[PDB]
Ligand binder design. Structure first.
Ligand SMILES: COc1ccnc(NC(=O)Cc2ccc3ccccc3c2)c1
Ligand SMILES: COc1ccnc(NC(=O)Cc2ccc3ccccc3c2)c1
Lengths: 304, 304
């Protein structure tokens, strides 16, 4: 037993991290096959960020202006293009460490592991979730743009995120590996306030089921509720509406503990209205929403 | 900006994980050079665990009784020995993925990354800390024994922990890579209640400094304290005593924010006596003690 925010092993992804420099700007790039993916703002000078015209800026750039370095060996750039907000640098060498991969655009509420990088070097790995407002609460400094978010399906790396921006609230913005930002964020140095960050209700329910599996059962009561009654209380606390599909997704957790989904919703309603009263669940004093029901089932079974 | 429980990249460690089977028991092993390290309880049957005599049990075992598998290739065991609570299986092949390494016995309060494994396969990575009572709050299931705890000094992996036991409270027990358990734990299926788990005060101070760096300054007050006055309040809340060495360790964080260590102790005293009042610090509703001051400085600087 035990419950932790566990990230996927980062080994396969580490073998893909490279350093991309353009002018005085160095950031991280994802080297897959003979392509290096990186946030297109690598071409901007700090003044250009204020109101950038990426196509105009990119006209002044040639292949030899992008320095790509995998460890300490320099890679030769033989082509460059812009796809949405990512530059794809075709190199003369295919990454021999390229794992089996996919580019996925994840749904809000889904989780992924981040391999935070500086100068093409992996520094740390941690778990994140795409918030319902399309921001992520990561840990990024200057030099971290180009860090990637990913999941692993046994041996296939599903890249879902690339870090590009820090927002005024301290949260982060990024794109899928096709250069499209999640949400309404643009790669411009302008204040882009995020929307209301709602709670991923299904994830909280999955983590309350993980808490039951672990031995923390103080919050379980003798009450039940209905989807409609639950959503009246969830809406008040900025919780995402609960659907029958969410109830079905919770199936293996509801069966494992023997506790009905609606019975757990009733316990969540009482935690929302009455608080934790100084108590904790899985060592947390608040309701955790960054474990999808898949993460909980995986951790409480034995998947690798 | 942003603050997360970040683990070191697990790539170097993944290349060392193998599966060790003995009888019907399969667990994980650490393959470094021509040696495979594993918890010696791999030789026990579930009945043997009740009161094991490891030397007697190990007499009935030969090299051919230990099955070592690195991925899907079988490794040949040409020697076996017991060192404290770890079996060292000498194999005929040196691990070509062996990174530069060290075996360290960490101090209580120190942190490390865990690469949780099942059948020699890495499943997840997360950060842990050695509690002052020598337990860890990990996430382990059956098949996870032999999972390792480690730190990385640029390119050198310092292995500090090997998972062996789950304790009645749900916490875990393990050994350093020389087979000595941290704490008074023994590899026997007997109830071994842990001692009082105290709070690593210095780690909470480092994480309160990280919170200031991040923009969360609500808890900062106009008060100060002395080491002796702070420790009177810390003792009451089961907090570890604060020494001048802890104050010195906090140096780069105290300089970075400009806030004296004793001024931050005063804010910690008010958080202890008055609680959080429904507020949060770095998205947590309780005082986090699993970021050493080194982790905080590292995350709030740019180390890889
Ligand atoms: C390379 O350029 C990058 C990289 C990463 N993040 C950014 N972010 C921004 O510029 C957005 C921002 C953030 C905070 C503000 C705070 C106040 C007033 C405006 C603000 C605008 C730019
Ligand atoms: C291979 O053997 C292993 C592996 C991992 N953990 C264990 N742990 C134990 O046996 C200790 C324990 C835990 C919980 C109890 C609860 C009640 C009564 C006694 C208890 C004893 C043994």
């Amino acid at each position: 037993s035990g419950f932790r925010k566990m990230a996927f092993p980062s080994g396969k992804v580490e073998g893909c991290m490279v350093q991309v420099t353009c002018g005085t700007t160095t950031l991280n790039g994802l080297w897959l096959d003979d392509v290096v993916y990186c946030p297109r703002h690598v071409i901007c000078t700090s003044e250009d960020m204020l109101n950038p015209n990426y196509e105009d800026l990119l006209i002044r750039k040639s292949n030899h202006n992008f320095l790509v370095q995998a460890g300490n060996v320099q890679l030769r750039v033989i082509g460059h293009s812009m796809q949405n907000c990512v530059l794809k640098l075709k190199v003369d060498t295919a990454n021999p460490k390229t794992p089996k991969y996919k580019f996925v655009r994840i749904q809000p509420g889904q989780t992924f592991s981040v391999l935070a990088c500086y100068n093409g070097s992996p520094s740390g790995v941690y778990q994140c979730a795409m918030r319902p407002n399309f921001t992520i609460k990561g840990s990024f400094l200057n030099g971290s743009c180009g860090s990637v978010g990913f999941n692993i399906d046994y041996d296939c790396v599903s890249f879902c995120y690339m870090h590009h921006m820090e927002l005024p609230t301290g949260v982060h913005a990024g794109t899928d590996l096709e250069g499209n930002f999640y949400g309404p964020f643009v790669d411009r140095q302008t204040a882009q306030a995020a929307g209301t960050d709602t709670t991923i209700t299904v994830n909280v329910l999955a983590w309350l089921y993980a808490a039951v599996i672990n031995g923390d059962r103080w919050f379980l009561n003798r009450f039940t509720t209905t989807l409609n009654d639950f959503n009246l209380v969830a809406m008040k606390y900025n919780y995402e509406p609960l659907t029958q599909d969410h109830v079905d997704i919770l199936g293996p957790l509801s069966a494992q503990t023997g506790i009905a989904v609606l019975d757990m919703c009733a316990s969540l309603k009482e935690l929302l209205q009455n608080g934790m009263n100084g108590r904790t669940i899985l060592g947390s004093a608040l309701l955790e929403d960054e474990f999808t029901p898949f993460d909980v089932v995986r951790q409480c079974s034995g998947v690798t």
